[PDB]
DNA sequence: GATTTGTCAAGTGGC
DNA sequence: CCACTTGACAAATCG
């Protein structure tokens, strides 16, 4: 409940997979949209529609009242993701 | 100064 | 409706 990591269990694997692949995050290195799509099976585009969905949806998901400000280059990716989403 | 990367609007098409 | 591609496009990117 400390990192927004632990809320990306809330997605199917390919919300998932397409975020932290995307990210840097998980244990993965941050990649482009191509050798995100090129990984999984997709076109570069549809890697980006997978992302804004599992983005978009992650907005609706974060709505449980979680005390929003816990946590928020020198960008660490958690800190790459939260300013994705909103 | 071109290649790469993200993005769009419109396209196929239904293990 | 859906997952997914196609083919354009400006802009970030890199040297």
Redesign the pocket.
Known sequence: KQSIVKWLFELNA?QREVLARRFGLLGYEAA???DV?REI??????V???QVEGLRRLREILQGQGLNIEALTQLTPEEKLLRAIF
């Open positions: 390919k482009t949209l191509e799509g099976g997709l076109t570069r585009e549809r980006r529609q997978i």
